[PDB]
Design a protein around this ligand. Structure first.
Ligand code: 5RP
Ligand code: R5P
Ligand code: NA
Ligand code: NA
Lengths: 218, 217
């Protein structure tokens, strides 16, 4: 079973939750990109999409799917996105692809967050995959010092700039004993724009694809 | 003459500049008078860190060397203004829209010298609005969340920060617990930073008035 095939199964399983005339928030990454291909097939049935990254926006426009600005939306019934790690509670680590900031923003406007993953993203405990932290560029060294004080090990993602013009520190070895408190503790640091811990905005449903099929972990 | 007062406060901060220091420099009209004072002692300065692109342009135009904050580990002094300040050293900042890099530089600096004319001194913070810097696509969302905190956000139309973001100027927030307020703004997704300076206080508050400059703190 190709990894591609599991991602396709999970993508198609999210399609079943799309109702006519919805505005659809779309996440980022390779699993989401198979979902974009599924959305193209039913794009006459929906109104528009909100894009969590410029890459996602380009892919949606290439399919002829209308894209609209989040500020022109107050009611977003569904957000579909992948994750780097997800557990049965629906807590996630996101940001491997560097889009965690707009991802968290769209996810917070959306009523229902559908997380689509193959089985390798499911973990019993969060924390092995690093936490991407988006940082104002001139604050890089200061923020890294503050993260070390929190017991994290930050690694600058060389050469990468986010959609928002910032850099990423990928942080290893943080404690996830209290993940909501951890998510806040990063964000209150001057120069931190956002971080990849999704503990305050959980996935409402977690669709996990394996060889047997797609399982609603949540 | 508010300008005369601002000049007095600026000169009073110059007395804290020692030889071979790297000097962090704030933003705004009071700081711009201090930039003119700094020019007169260029020979004494190693370099300055700039809290805004505008401040960098003013420093470079005086021939004052500018270095990037990521290259600095020892930043002994930061000199900045404020929109409001109390004797505790809590401040509202961001009237000029530079509050994000200001707070970053302030937090690297050892000593924060706040320079103000008398009109900036308040017993209770809160009359001047709190500038909140927001990821542009998150604007309406952040506004809705700020309304839930009891604030009235007003989009600063046409303005873009040094970081490519927009400002909501927020009125009527409760300052009963200023540090918790500062945090509650910064945890909202899409908020980059806000103008409440309650976790990083001014270490010295130099207040210019008719009678001279008084160290409120
Ligand atoms: O925080 C600031 C800009 O972001 C300024 O320091 C503040 O607005 C005070 O400026 P001025 O001295 O012109 O009153
Ligand atoms: O910013 C990146 C997002 O968190 C992605 O949704 C996440 O990295 C999952 O990506 P993929 O489906 O390619 O594994
Ligand atoms: Na922050
Ligand atoms: Na935030």
């Amino acid at each position: 079973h190709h990894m591609s095939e599991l991602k396709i199964k999970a993508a198609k399983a999210a399609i079943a939750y799309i109702e006519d005339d919805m505005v659809i928030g779309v996440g980022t990454g390779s699993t989401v990109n198979f979902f974009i291909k599924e959305l193209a097939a039913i794009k006459h049935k929906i109104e528009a999409c909100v894009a969590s990254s410029k890459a996602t926006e380009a892919l949606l426009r290439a399919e002829g799917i209308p894209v609209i600005d989040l500020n022109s939306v107050q009611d977003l019934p569904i957000y579909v996105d992948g994750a780097d790690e997800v557990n049965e509670r629906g807590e996630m680590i996101k940001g491997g692809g560097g889009a965690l900031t707009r991802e968290k923003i769209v996810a917070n406007v959306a009523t229902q967050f559908i997380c689509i993953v193959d089985e390798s993203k499911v973990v019993k405990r969060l924390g092995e995959f690093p936490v991407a932290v988006e940082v104002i560029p001139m604050a890089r060294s200061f923020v890294a010092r503050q993260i070390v004080k929190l017991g994290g090990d930050p690694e600058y993602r060389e050469g990468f700039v986010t959609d928002n013009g910032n850099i990423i520190l990928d942080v290893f070895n943080l404690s996830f004993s209290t993940p909501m408190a951890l998510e806040d503790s990063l964000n209150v640091i001057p120069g931190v724009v956002e971080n990849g811990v999704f503990a305050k905005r959980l996935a409402d449903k977690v669709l996990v694809a394996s060889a047997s099929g797609v399982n609603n972990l949540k």
